[PDB]
Amino acid sequence: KELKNIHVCLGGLFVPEAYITATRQYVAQANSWSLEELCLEVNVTTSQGATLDACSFGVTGLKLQGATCNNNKLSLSNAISTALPLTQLRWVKQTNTEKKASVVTLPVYLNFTRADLIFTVDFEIATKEDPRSFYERGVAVLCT
């Protein structure tokens, strides 16, 4: 039971993608859902150690490149990197409600080389910022 409620550094894992699949398997088995029906949603909380629900998993060490996360809203920044305090990975059913027109799919690369892609995160933008501007400025998420 404690293995579910530990905060895991994705960069330090030997195979980070197996953890994401393993958390996906646990949620489906517990909720009697099919594996393919599960979808991943991202929630960044400043207070590390916050309580995780039945389907939320906390991953730490993630670094945000070229953007700052505030109230789960991404904003373009002039800094090279921005540390994410605690990323809560939640597995939910697919509701196919289309995009919100302010949602950008950020790649989550293992490292700064941007060679191996672990998964993708669907963050939402704040204010009047352009989702194209995020694409042009190379905004991404780094595990380590």
């Binding site: 490149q65 070229g66 700064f112 080389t113 941007r114 060679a115 190379g138």
Partner: protein, 145 residues
């Protein structure tokens, strides 16, 4: 006469082309000469003891390989071809390479289309200098594109 170096008969065509051109005065270009460094040393020796035609020119295409003979580099004139330093230099190279007649055709809107193409090509090529941020890998966005 253009010859690609790398085949046994390719050296024969290179020798025949050079022997004829030094008298007729034509141009001979040999590409990928860096793949035959041993034959390059013989080529440099042959060129040193030679009295070619005034209009004869020999072009050697290589890839800045560290195995290119030093004596060949000293004997010949070196021109280094690389990505242009910036957007302004990138667009100047594009506009110079394209013939003036091609840009100026019957539709007067063709010129602006070429300018946008030149600007677009310059932007993506300059983004390659920043490998992780500009792209995800060093793509080969070159003249062929």
């Amino acid at each position: 006469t253009s010859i690609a170096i790398g085949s046994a008969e390719g050296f024969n065509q290179a020798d025949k082309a050079i022997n004829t051109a030094v008298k007729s005065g034509r141009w001979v270009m040999l590409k990928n000469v860096h793949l035959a460094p041993g034959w390059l040393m013989q080529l440099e020796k042959k060129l040193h003891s030679l009295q070619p035609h005034a209009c004869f020119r020999l072009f050697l295409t290589m890839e800045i390989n560290p195995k290119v003979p030093v004596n060949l580099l000293r004997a010949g004139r070196i021109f280094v071809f690389e990505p242009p330093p910036g957007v302004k230099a990138n667009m100047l190279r594009t506009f110079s390479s394209i013939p003036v007649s091609r840009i100026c055709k019957s539709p007067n809107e063709r010129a602006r289309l070429y300018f946008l193409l030149a600007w677009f090509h310059a932007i993506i090529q300059e983004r390659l200098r920043y490998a992780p941020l500009g792209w995800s890998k060093k793509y080969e966005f070159g003249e062929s594109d």
